[PDB]
Design a protein around this ligand. Structure first.
Ligand SMILES: COP(=O)(O)[C@@](O)(c1ccccc1)c1sc(CCOP(=O)(O)OP(=O)(O)O)c(C)[n+]1Cc1cnc(C)nc1N
Ligand SMILES: COP(=O)(O)[C@@](O)(c1ccccc1)c1sc(CCOP(=O)(O)OP(=O)(O)O)c(C)[n+]1Cc1cnc(C)nc1N
Ligand SMILES: COP(=O)(O)[C@@](O)(c1ccccc1)c1sc(CCOP(=O)(O)OP(=O)(O)O)c(C)[n+]1Cc1cnc(C)nc1N
Ligand SMILES: COP(=O)(O)[C@@](O)(c1ccccc1)c1sc(CCOP(=O)(O)OP(=O)(O)O)c(C)[n+]1Cc1cnc(C)nc1N
Ligand SMILES: [Ca+2]
Ligand SMILES: [Ca+2]
Ligand SMILES: [Ca+2]
Lengths: 554, 554, 554
């Protein structure tokens, strides 16, 4: 009859539909651990709270659902701050559940207390709040979930004092609310949708650019219907890329990065329809190099701040991206009078091929394995049944060159934070979500980045998650070493070299399969072997450092 | 060719469509004052930054547009804090432009610097930011405006360093952006809209409740079309009241407080459609006294946190309230005949009438003028050409009982903050907005509350604003004195009596017309005379303290 | 046996030795009001929380003790923010006690809640904290007081939820702690004190500069002993000025401002001993105009950040200023071998006279009363039995010219915030403290500044505080109008004129004595008459606008 506050948390999460949590144990949060045991709710316990926080992100991004992180008081929270900051800029729906010092014995200099965790998370969350009463738990947890899941998606910090969690109350008096929040996002006014479709109809070279919000809602059947009716080529940033996987080949522009060479071929887009894609790092800021200044821009984003923040736009609609794609498909289903644009769809594909073929001709593995050749080996295994998680710096910049011609089930790369090392946790959580959908997860990381969470091979083995970790070992912090050589001088390299360590040996010591390769053939076999087994795998790949990816210079 | 940073602010403001500013001069913000002088943009300068901030709120609320407050470094900002907090909780679109210490001489213990103004405003603003470069001004001002105007509406702080404002750049080097933000808000998914209407048709006693976001968008014709087609009675909180003024009489429930006596009469609403109305103070929190626990609730709000915040709902839609109303009118114009609902509308009217009649029978002006009788005198002068601003606890609690039967052009009352004294500034700015709309502003306030900004009679006289200030003088901080008597004891009054001061004398000293009255006949005459003149006025009304308004008890 | 949380607050304040509180009533904080009634502890209730907050500052500054402000939830707190910011930069010990929304019904959109008051005050307090349990009240209130009173002095925000205050607990179980904090501040290491005294002994032109921390501890008998033994001239900023009142005339350098002309007469100080005085607005930043670059600087400040922040120093000691003055006196009491320096003490006095005599020759009241002549009239009445509070801009800049030759009991002027209008509240609280010591308080304010808190004449009358309010009426926001004329042009004056209002008429309407004067003779009589009566007084003084004070240009 009397239940704990931690029991109230879990019962509310269950009603919200959460099936997995990611965390690291603390006594402060044991009531949640105990309640999850009773309800058969798995908590994937990691070796670092950061890895657990990133895992919650990866699960959310790969699964297009809510991710739930569970950390303890003090160091538990502070270790989860990078994940929060990452999810903030990436717009990923994660409920960060954290313990804190009991409300009683406030200001007593006790263990794991004395830190204002809410204030620390306030600048990097949609909502950061501390629970003041055990009876408030169900409604506040549900409020937190509603905040995280709504447009634009983002992290929420819910702080649960040890006091509030251990407290026992009458279960018959406290109500557990349902998640009553519409799955269909708000759509544009018909007049705005008409104006958008009217501009798209008279455009000579229209282009659609998808952002992260297009991935969160994942209206794939609606997207295909709109694209098949209009015949407009679709581009996407890293986070929007997996949304292109269900589209016909002739309509796939790929990553927005290869819209760079369009100005030179006098093929700079006439109209650009930005759906969730923001003006920033991925879309070339307000330089006009990707999104042209001469082009008329229709931008749809749940945040009005983003509406033409770095560039003049022709139309700015505040609405949900999933709802807009749904609306665009619905309106165009009865239209049936759209221009051909087959020649324009051929031009965007040829220009993307022009880029890829140019890089291939300049790449050679005559002495050491070229990063681009290493990227191709992975690309050969990438389809709708595979989630690719990208970390490192040169590693991801090289990998992006092969990603726009394959159709991944998921592509989870760096966002605005660009924080090295987030990939391991991200991929771990992604694999948990991929197990549900019957997909395989592959992490492509740098030798520098992998060291951040290399202890997670233990978690892979303990939890039997068949994640394949590919380390692009160029014996250094690559892109930073490249900056030292190019921006300062060839003899000005310090603190960027990493000429030590057997990463596959580390993985083997944790119980995971460890491969080490230094050629195309050996890497091909190791990757094929890793895919064939239902085990955690590490593939340490010896890769050349000298080559400069086009995206580094740009 | 060379223009100041202040010029960039003003040129962006003009391109945004702002015609009035409210502020207090400072040397740090002089470049904005000088630029407004050149462009003939009037800055209504007050005697307190709080009044200027409140005036911008009142201008925003009465004119259903963007209010712009303009304050200086240090104390200029800190004096604007209450207006910011008030605009935050009330959801009013106000751009707060503030000066700050120069970026040069940072951390030099200089005049009006040394306080982190953004950090202070961050917990109570949609966005708070400090400009780092003069070149960034136009895009940042525009971004701030887009943030303020978008759902849910709210205040934005733009911190503009003296250094940044004084700096001069070539006018052709930085472009002034247009306000490219759709005036049409996002609307619900057709499926959600159809479920809402399906519930509305099936309901036996359906009710609509409007909130602040309905007033901000002001889709009056759409609301009228939707209401007439469905025949469903409409209620509103304080801020949504003026949106009932264009609606047919039989469909008017008045203020949401009227729902209280519906449970006793077995007439508790079967269904309630909440449009912008949040679960909180004005709707009876989660008590179920106004919004019944047994009712099926359709809630429409731009913020997902609010959806079923304190009470379980049947359907939670995240969308713009104005866009939703427009979508509801559009859908109900082209569907099947809706049920009559004539008898239910009559029941709503009669219960509101029975409350009004019950108070009138218990109100007696023998010995001293009764607050309800004083409220009736004002009520006989309220219509579409009148904006009523309410302050002062017991004052507005009594005044609310007469506001449902009348149809004001605007009704600006306390929100969640419930800060005494905000009314004067609010009414001052509302009068500026009413002047271009051809309306008259009347402030109804307490003797305690008026003292906060009593120096604004000077501003009324200097700027020739014909605001009528009605002071309900019960010679005390009334409601708080009642709290002491009811909750503690009869001999337990302390710090709540104000048995001093001729407020009509104060106004006269500032040059305003000053009336002192103590009866129905004398107050009627004074108010009639004040309405007949194009002059600012103060009517000091001696009123009884003992009467307890129904709304105080509940 | 069972007592409220508000009772615990008052019992703790009593044990701390507080005899007065300054506030404005709210139901949220009624338990404190009720407990003060029972214990005969006066709460000076004002007409604005800002005035109450400033009153707490003034009481603290004039009394050299702890000031206690008491404000309610929501608007109560936000109205008190300017006082907090002012006390923060001024380093004045004030305990800001604020109500807030009950911890139960957190996140319920209820009255006066939903604002994070702690986060808003965090950037401008030594400590901002919310009380989480009724049992914690006594220890946390005492902790707050210890924080405010210790070096450097500053404001503390203690947030007391309505919940926590109304809660009743067993009085026999909760202990009320004593204030156990040493009144003698920490002193420098003997080696540092020796090095300081050794530099002072060989110096040709040594000067002592006192800051606010010298006033807070007020070690007057120790200061005189050190000055009489060494014969070093003593300067002070506005806040340190009253500490010079017990010194011999030949040792009084006055305000640090007249150290400006020392470089021209080749009398730029050889050594400067800064005691609590910071590098900033009052000491001419790091320009070298007051504190020379060639001079060796010994700086003593409880904050290490301040130790040579804008200028190179020779010795930096982190210690309490009161403890240092005590230590300097103790060491020099047995020394008795100090150089004469009578000629240097004569030179500093002559240079101060040179300044005063130069201004007098340029001042004329032939057409309108000159601000300097008006300042002289006040100066004639200023001694150890008088506290002078200075507001306005030109008003205080002119008044500072006559202050360095009189010996005020107190001088409370603007600090770094420079916030216009703070003077009324400041003076009101100062008068309460002056009633204890048998002193009279005189506020010298501008016509612009007085409008901020002009309703406080009511409080003066209600509480029978004999404060004399002198308004220097130049029909405008003077210094800002001067900036428009000098920095932009003679025809570029907007929003700075105030050609309306009878301020004495306003004061008379509130029940206070109202004088209006426009000549030396009439002002002399009005001031003499105001001093003769034990009543609140307003002296509206017609004063010339055109004259430019030397401190404005500098
Ligand atoms: C009472 O609180 P407890 O939860 O029991 C814990 O916080 C603790 C217990 C006793 C002393 C100090 C800390 C402890 S003790 C503890 C186990 C440490 O395991 P380890 O194998 O390192 O040493 P040992 O105890 O087996 O000798 C954990 C995970 N926590 C929670 C925790 C999680 N993540 C981070 C970053 N810091 C933490 N303190
Ligand atoms: C331009 O800025 P850069 O400093 O060069 C850097 O931030 C970056 C990020 C994205 C693309 C290119 C460079 C990068 S790139 C980089 C090297 C990564 O080395 P890694 O071995 O993982 O991959 P690779 O580049 O050698 O293939 C570092 C250390 N940083 C700074 C950094 C430090 N610590 C953390 C948590 N995150 C970071 N991003
Ligand atoms: C329940 O809380 P209460 O303390 O009773 C109070 O906050 C209140 C009471 C009923 C409705 C709304 C607010 C009220 S009501 C109230 C008295 C208002 O006096 P006034 O003479 O203005 O009008 P009236 O009641 O006599 O008609 C005060 C001082 N307060 C606290 C307060 C103090 N300072 C500021 C800036 N805002 C505030 N709300
Ligand atoms: C150099 O900056 P300035 O803007 O000129 C100003 O801040 C100032 C402060 C100290 C000395 C000189 C000027 C001043 S001086 C000033 C005029 C004060 O007029 P007042 O009638 O009170 O006295 P006087 O100068 O005419 O004798 C104003 C409005 N401001 C800006 C301001 C606005 N609102 C608040 C709460 N505090 C402020 N300080
Ligand atoms: Ca690498
Ligand atoms: Ca009243
Ligand atoms: Ca003046």
């Amino acid at each position: 009859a009397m239940i704990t506050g931690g029991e109230l948390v879990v019962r509310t999460l269950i009603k919200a539909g959460v099936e997995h949590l990611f965390g690291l144990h603390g006594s402060h949060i044991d009531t949640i651990f105990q309640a999850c045991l009773d309800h058969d709710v798995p908590i994937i316990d990691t070796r670092h709270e950061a890895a657990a926080g990133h895992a919650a992100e990866g699960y959310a991004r790969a699964g297009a659902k809510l991710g739930v992180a569970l950390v303890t008081a003090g160091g538990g929270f502070t270790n989860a701050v990078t994940p929060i900051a990452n999810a903030w800029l990436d717009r990923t729906p994660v409920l960060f559940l954290t313990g804190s010092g009991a409300l009683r014995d406030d200001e007593t200099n006790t263990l794991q207390a004395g830190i204002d965790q809410v204030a620390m998370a306030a600048p990097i969350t949609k909502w950061a709040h501390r629970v003041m009463a055990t009876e408030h738990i169900p409604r506040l947890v549900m409020q937190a979930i509603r905040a995280a899941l709504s447009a634009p998606r983002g992290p929420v910090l819910l702080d649960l004092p040890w006091d509030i969690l251990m407290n026992q109350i009458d279960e018959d008096s406290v109500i557990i609310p349902d998640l009553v929040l519409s799955a269909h996002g708000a759509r544009p006014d018909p007049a705005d949708l008409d104006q958008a479709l009217a501009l798209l109809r008279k455009a000579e070279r229209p282009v659609i650019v998808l952002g992260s919000e297009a991935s969160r809602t994942a209206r794939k059947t609606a997207l295909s219907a709109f694209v098949a009716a209009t015949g407009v080529p679709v581009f996407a940033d890293y986070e929007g890329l997996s949304m292109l996987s269900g589209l016909p080949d002739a309509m796939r522009g790929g990553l927005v990065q290869n819209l760079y060479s369009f100005a030179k071929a006098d093929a700079a887009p006439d109209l650009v329809l930005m759906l969730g894609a923001r003006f920033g790092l991925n879309t070339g800021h307000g330089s006009g190099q990707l999104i042209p200044h001469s082009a008329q821009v229709i931008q749809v984003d749940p945040d009005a701040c983003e509406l033409g923040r770095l560039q003049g736009i022709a139309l700015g609609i505040v609405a949900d991206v999933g709802g807009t794609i749904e609306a665009l498909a619905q309106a165009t289903a009865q239209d049936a009078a759209w221009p051909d644009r087959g020649d324009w769809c051929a031009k965007v594909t040829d220009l993307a091929q022009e880029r890829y073929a140019s890089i291939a001709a300049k790449s050679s593995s005559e002495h050491a394995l070229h990063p681009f050749h290493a990227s191709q080996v992975i690309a050969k295994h990438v389809d709708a049944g595979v989630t690719v998680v990208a970390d490192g710096a040169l590693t991801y910049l090289w990998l992006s060159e092969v990603m726009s011609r394959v159709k991944p089930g998921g592509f989870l790369c760096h966002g605005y934070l660009g924080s090295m090392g987030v990939g391991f946790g991200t991929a771990l959580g992604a694999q948990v979500a991929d197990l549900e959908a019957g997909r395989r997860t592959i992490l492509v990381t740098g030798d520098g980045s992998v060291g951040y969470s290399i202890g997670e091979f233990d978690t892979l083995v303990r939890k039997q998650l068949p994640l394949i970790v590919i380390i692009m070992n160029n014996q250094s912090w690559g892109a930073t070493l490249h900056f030292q050589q190019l921006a300062v001088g060839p003899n000005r390299v310090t603190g960027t070299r990493l000429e030590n360590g057997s990463y596959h040996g580390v993985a083997a010591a944790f119980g995971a399969d460890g491969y080490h390769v230094d050629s195309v053939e050996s890497f091909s076999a190791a990757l094929a072997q890793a895919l064939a087994h239902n085990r955690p795998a590490c593939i340490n790949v010896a890769v050349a450092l000298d080559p400069i990816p086009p995206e580094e210079l740009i």
